[PDB]
Design goal:
Length: about 110
């Protein structure tokens, strides 16, 4: 659980599997850091987050647990501080590596 978190092991694993499966094992990753892109349409949006500057994309969604401290919240992140977060790893094109932004511990760095 670290930063657009760990997965050396699932790319080795996740990569191939069926949904059910993808899940069965599922890791909800993210963490910290910061970024710059939003992909809004009012509610549940898609964002692109990283750290130092080499991002991955997330899926800020208010579909099941219809949270906020969202994409906007994301819009809001600054510095001094930083994010702590988790989204699920899920199907971008096949069923791997994109984040599905759901629970964030987004404030501090420190």
């Amino acid at each position: 659980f670290r930063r657009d978190h760990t997965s050396d092991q699932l790319h080795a694993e996740f990569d191939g599997k069926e949904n059910e499966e993808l899940e069965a094992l599922n890791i909800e990753v993210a963490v910290a850091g910061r970024m710059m892109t939003r992909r809004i349409m009012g509610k549940a949006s898609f964002v692109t987050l990283q750290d130092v500057g080499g991002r991955i994309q997330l899926y800020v969604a208010r579909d099941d647990l219809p949270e906020g401290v969202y994409n906007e919240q994301f819009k809001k992140w600054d510095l001094g501080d930083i994010l702590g977060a988790k989204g699920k790893l899920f199907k971008t094109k096949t069923g791997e590596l994109s984040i599905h932004c759901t629970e964030l511990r987004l404030l501090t760095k420190a």
